Amino acid sequence: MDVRCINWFESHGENRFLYLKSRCRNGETVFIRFPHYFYYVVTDEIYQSLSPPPFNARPMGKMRTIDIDETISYNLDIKDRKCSVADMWLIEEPKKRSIQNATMDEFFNISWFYISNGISPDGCYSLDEQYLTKINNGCYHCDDPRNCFAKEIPRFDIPRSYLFLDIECHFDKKFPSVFINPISHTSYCYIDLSGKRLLFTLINEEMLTEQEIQEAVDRGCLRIQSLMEMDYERELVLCSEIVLLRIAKQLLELTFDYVVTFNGHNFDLRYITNRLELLTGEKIIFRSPDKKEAVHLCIYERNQSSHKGVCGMANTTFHVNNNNGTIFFDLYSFIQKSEKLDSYKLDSISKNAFSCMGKVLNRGVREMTFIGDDTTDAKGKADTFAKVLTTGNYVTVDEDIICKVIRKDILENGFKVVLSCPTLPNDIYKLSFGKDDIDLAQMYKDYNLNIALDMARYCIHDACLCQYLWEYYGVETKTDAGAATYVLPQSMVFEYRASTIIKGPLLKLLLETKTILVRSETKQKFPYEGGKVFAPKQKMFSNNVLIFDYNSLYPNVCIFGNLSPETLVGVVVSTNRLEEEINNQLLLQKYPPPRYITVHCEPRLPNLISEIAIFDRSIEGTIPRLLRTFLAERARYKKMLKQATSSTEKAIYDSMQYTYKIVANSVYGLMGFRNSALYSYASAKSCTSIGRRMILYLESVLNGAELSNGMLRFANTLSNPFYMDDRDINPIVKTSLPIDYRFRFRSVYGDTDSVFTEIDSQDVDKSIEIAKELERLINSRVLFNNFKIEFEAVYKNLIMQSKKKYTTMKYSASSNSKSVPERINKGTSETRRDVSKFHKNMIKTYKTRLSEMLSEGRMNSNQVCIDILRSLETDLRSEFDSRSSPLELFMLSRMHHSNYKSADNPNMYLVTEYNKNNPETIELGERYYFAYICPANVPWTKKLVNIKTYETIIDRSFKLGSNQRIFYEVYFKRLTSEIVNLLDNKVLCISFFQRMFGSRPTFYEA
Amino acid sequence: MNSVTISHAPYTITYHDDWEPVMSQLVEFYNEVASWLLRDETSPIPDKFFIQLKQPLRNKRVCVCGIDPYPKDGTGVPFESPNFTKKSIKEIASSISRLTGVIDYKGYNLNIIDGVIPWNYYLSCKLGETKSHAIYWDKISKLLLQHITKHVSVLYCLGKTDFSNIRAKLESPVTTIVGYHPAARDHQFEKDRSFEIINVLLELDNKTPINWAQGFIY
Amino acid sequence: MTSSADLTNLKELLSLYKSLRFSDSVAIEKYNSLVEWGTSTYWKIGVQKVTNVETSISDYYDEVKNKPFNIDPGYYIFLPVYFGSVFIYSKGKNMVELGSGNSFQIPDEIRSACNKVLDSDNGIDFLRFVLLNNRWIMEDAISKYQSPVNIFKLASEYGLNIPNYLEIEIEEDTLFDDELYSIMERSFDDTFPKISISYIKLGELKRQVVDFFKFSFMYIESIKVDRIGDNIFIPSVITKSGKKILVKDVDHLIRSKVREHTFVKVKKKNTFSILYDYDGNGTETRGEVIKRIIDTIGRDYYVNGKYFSKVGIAGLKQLTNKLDINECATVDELVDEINKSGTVKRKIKNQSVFDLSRECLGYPEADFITLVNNMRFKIENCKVVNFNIENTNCLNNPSIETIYGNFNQFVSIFNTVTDVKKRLFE
Amino acid sequence: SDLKVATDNIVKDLKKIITRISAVSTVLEDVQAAGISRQFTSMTKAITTLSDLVTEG
Amino acid sequence: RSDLSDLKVATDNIVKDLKKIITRISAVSTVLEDVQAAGISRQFTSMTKAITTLSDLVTEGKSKVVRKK
Amino acid sequence: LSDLKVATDNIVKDLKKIITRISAVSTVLEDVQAAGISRQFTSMTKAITTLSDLVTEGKSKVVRK
Amino acid sequence: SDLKVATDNIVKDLKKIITRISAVSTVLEDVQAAGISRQFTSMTKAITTLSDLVTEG
DNA sequence: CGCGGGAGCTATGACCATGATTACGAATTGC
DNA sequence: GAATAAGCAATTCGTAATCATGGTCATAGCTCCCGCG
């Protein structure tokens, strides 16, 4: 009996039960109920003495228990790490049991259900019907999960059901309040089990007069009076708010696979349940698959406390208390977790997501026709833009121009759109779905039928935009990947951070490797060094630099050095040079260099001068095997990334390989995280130490490296920096390049593993071919074991502001001279979310200007500074006097949290005053727009204090008053400081900074 | 003891002068939530909703906070029952009797103790349902408990599931003790030591410890 | 949060909050971890973390009257306030110096006896101590509900040096003049130098320290060292008239900035001469003061904690005196005797080779770690066959330079201890 | 050379006074150190005026 | 020396002697002014060296007493 | 010259400087006597005799009477 | 040998003072005359002390 | 003739305002 | 009723404690101006 796992979900209250949502090949949804136990791991003697006997016990095999405690030794009398190899038992308890000296307690009962029963949460299984008993229609009970979930058949596709929805509520105030404000429009994207995608919007008839309601009926919309009269095929249905909420309750009570909303748990579904229990007292009742218990839709607040500083409450996600198995998915929390954008409102997410380049076919007085195909932009971008445009109403031309869609044609391989656009000079423009040129509250004041139909269109665009963001991010593929790898339920894949998604495959490993990691003493946290970031040698590069990046540097460091909490033989520390030399000699003669790696680190304590951690590379560690699992998954999704043609699947697979990169670096990070079960201070410290030695090794072989007569000479020897190995250390390496190539290499910059290798060539194709030869030669000769560098790209016109701050044009490894460069900004003002759009636009314009008049090269740099500062003063005074740039160019953004050392922090104070004074509440982890606003009668301010008191949180309904103005002085001061960092010429820049802002500017030191 | 006028429900709110800086916002939220609140038959009568507004806040240093009143027979004062038929006040009295040794008592009352203000987070609920009027009392509960935690030193919460979000629902930091509910299963309220933890955390703040024997009714 | 163990941790947090001025840095860090636990668990708490705590017991001691005064009637136990460095031993169970808050190394039998004393009564806040001429004397014992004479007898059982406690009965308003002060100081009948006397009521806390003296200024002839141990020397300073002014520590010499032929602030007593606890106003830095003091005493002396220590030919004799065992001439009978004595064998197990060789020659911890950290070692088979120094910046310190001069003898004893450890357990 | 032996007696007596300052200045209180520093500033005024008279004439 | 106490009589005596030393050096300064105004030719290189040694001695006595904390 | 106030102010300002100069001569004389050198003051005895004589006739002639 | 020529300069200065006193002293007015008389008595005291210092040997 | 009351000057240590320096935390990003 | 959390490096911006420098203010020397017995 073939099924595919859709969702796993636990019962809460009465008997503790675990359920599986599954579908067969024919599409009939099958539920499997399990007796969900509390899982405990004890030794043989503790299993023999448990006072009451267990409900169920499973022989877990003779499993070693290693005490992962980092006790520093001042000599080489390290006592052996406490390994107690004993036969183990899995205690399956229906209720929670407090067991003395029970091990493996960090893992959850759901992962213990998965791995001890051999069940993959992303799996296809042929279920043995002799172990399944039928509770009711559609649900079964399985008492034996080993034998029933034994045959793992390959993957087959299933008809997934979906409910994408967005609601629109009338507000005459700033924000809707459900006690006073009704619901105007609710739109639903019903994708049923047959694949039928139904787009229908419910319109509140209580806002329209009877003649207006008759006019809406005559325009083709359906009138209903009850729940039974509702037709899902009709795209526009008018009803009362009670009937609208009953339709919402009927749809949310349906056992979907996925109810996907944007900010819907916090606003939309909460507002639906609130208005439903106000207007008629009904509740959206979620039923269990066996219908033993029933719960109501209560949006329970779940708050993620921080793990740094005072560990304050840093993020709030909202979820649905449902026991039916529908994964009620909030896209808002998901895209906050995944993406890094200025705002996480739906307009900003669709601005970032569905951005396409379109060329102009027809130019009119007010109608511009854009077309977009596979020739205008990347492949699949125009198809996604067409699919968004199928329900879209407004397209943002370039960045600051918002244009209404007049006519939309969906082509075979792209889109053709007619827009309400003024005449523009350039032929190709970026098209995106950003903001709208509407004022929602004002068109609520004069609310008529045309407004009702346009806002039905906007609300169906938002409900379908949930689907378009669902398929853009590939959330079902990400959910399947998370269920397969992290060994978690599909509802539980995204709601957790690194440690929980580690705990699945970690437990898979610890059952396979037969290892238990326990602790006796308390864990101690010390500040340890991280990656090696080199200083940039020069600010500007007219020369090509080659970018060589270690493939997963810290995972390969952990796998190479066997850096695990249980493979740490001991930490040898010395307060003095004498016992340091004694311990060094005993280290060389006691621990062999191939079997044990000895990692010289900076000390954890100031009295120590040396700290050597010894790791045994004979048994493969838990952290290295977990990292081999995660880079196996990452290499698999990188292989699908290279095999993806459309930009949709390319973005999805790039996001998933980046996610596996982040979780692989999180395996490292939990060893530096003191509250983690995998906390190993010596292993994380040795990880950064071996990584830093790899950085210095790759830097030293590339700094001063030359290629001449086809023969590439590294400046230093090709020695393994930790031990002597059998590979050759000769820097004279044979190439596969032409003999006439005579080029020199200079490592100008290193940002942890990525080293920036300046070749004296300026040709793109020559640099790409030579750097591919360098990557192959380094991977074959310079590097060793799992260490492999990758030539990411050639960075042309590299403008290094500082460490981790550079601007360049990127020529990738698959690119050539004829390929279009990609402007990569890393950590500059354009990337930074605390930097205003006016600052970003002005620094981009002035960087282009500086590149132009530095490429001219006919006139002196003092006059460069004079001309750029004069144009800057003219532009800033024009902005200060004219004030033509709107508030949207001057909104900063920052995340709201509670993780503050001071209780009277001004940012927290500002958000709390906003939440008191306004019906819009900013949750923890929410991104809010704030701007520096002062009264307009205030003149130009030289001596500036109390800057954070001028901050004002800006929302969609904020309008800058006549008395108010943007405090331009702080934005101008930051922009001027960035420009005089770029301009050098310190004395005249201090003179201009004091003549305009009355202060000493901060100049970066190389 | 200043008073304000509201449009409906008790039509007056009597409050102590320490409750003044959160009173206009209280009227602002109550004027929109009370019209929907009044249709459901509430467990306390509406005139007893703001009895605890009359209590001062300068002398109070411990907030013994519940999530809501009892589902039946709400007297308007949190953890108060003259009939002494409520399990929550019964096991609170059992814990105080196990601490102080005073076992010969007719009843217990957390309101008569100096320095202890008894609080219900949601100020009302439906007759027979727990946390029913959470929807009506979110903003009011956040406002009033943040006002309490500005003045008191120690906040004691009688619930894990109900007060798991209390560090977010209050923005100013305060000594929060998220204790178990008395009706919580596995006799977790019998096992825990929260009242002496209240006294020790008061002595850490250089405050006068609560004498818990003042609340006994003989 | 809510359990019994959390109540226990909070009670310990309150107990070490009440003894912040009395605790060592280990107990200060324990208090800080308890503050961190209470901040992570109970969100805001009343107590903060502390970085630098001034060690002062002036909350339990009244302001010194320094004038004759009438004594109220009642019971009185007059206790001799001695001259040496005041040490307090809190519930953190390490020695705490006033004004510095640094743990200081002590003989183990004294530490075990004080452990037994604090195991006898947990109501004792701390025990007040004297460090003068390397001999640990209980000043005082401060307890909430017990008279200090019981602790004095109880520690007299354990072998600590206990002063002559005297309980005298006062029934009238007797004036406490300098003559009755001299009568009571000779009624103590101690050779040990006393700076003042503190008295306690039978039923009323907040001890008063009464001190009759005169601030005096005598011209200094020279600074003379006097042997008080196997290697350590007390500092003493001498007037031109021949009267000896006692000095508390070497840190008393640098802190007062004593040099020859200068007037010093001395508190004259009936018999003893007491140098005042004052900061020197000569504006010379601490290193140059150390340089001048070592130059006028001799370059074979180095600053070792509170005392100067000598250098010389250091062989098996000082190793046997450090081990407190019988004297052995060769290595082999020394290892055989260590095999005879199980406790010394266990001590050599728990204590490393460098620590044994450093405490054998009486070297300090920090200065010798600084000196070893600036030289290089050629080492063959756990032995120092050659040494050369890289940084000569530490050699400006005369203590570090003196220890570098005696480094050859340190190498010899280090190799001897290395051979002993090699044939003991390998 | 009456002025020469006068300045020789001045520097000898002032050397004796500075020797006594070196003897007593380790234990001086703040107010008397401020007073003797005031007298030393008057000393510096006197020797700079003498320097002006022997330089300018 | 003897057994001295309470240095303010010694401080007043040292300040009075320094007052005498100041009046003596101001006396020789104004009589040097008068004899330079008289018009006699004088060579004062050794006088300048004596003033330099006097200033060095005065600042040697100065550097030990002025600065607190 | 009117009202003779400026002449009196000038002679007061001059005579206090003369007094300071005379005390300065006495102080440097005490310094050279305490230095220990052997000196003769006979020419200065004649000088102090004639200046004392002339200032005694000035004192006899300056009286207001 | 500088003290005798300095004393000669002082003899010339007091000669100038006595000649201008004899020029202007036809009227002096009583309070300033008493002031310069007390100045002459203080000057006589100072010259008497200097005479004691030159006759003490 | 000789010392006390008084008034003006000259620095001089100390207190405070202003502005530059630096630690310190948040916010972000790069890794 | 109750049932987690990746590290460090580096840059910039704002706030606040600390300190250099200068202005100012009480105060000690200090030195003459005048006076009265």
Ligand SMILES: Cc1cn([C@H]2CC[C@@H](COP(=O)(O)OP(=O)(O)OP(=O)(O)O)O2)c(=O)[nH]c1=O
């Ligand atoms: C991004 C990131 C990285 N790290 C560590 C871990 C390694 C180094 C360098 O990793 P990088 O992204 O440059 O390249 P890397 O990932 O090593 O190379 P690949 O892109 O996987 O090929 O930084 C981390 O701790 N947390 C993170 O979020």
Ligand SMILES: [Mg+2]
């Ligand atoms: Mg990399």
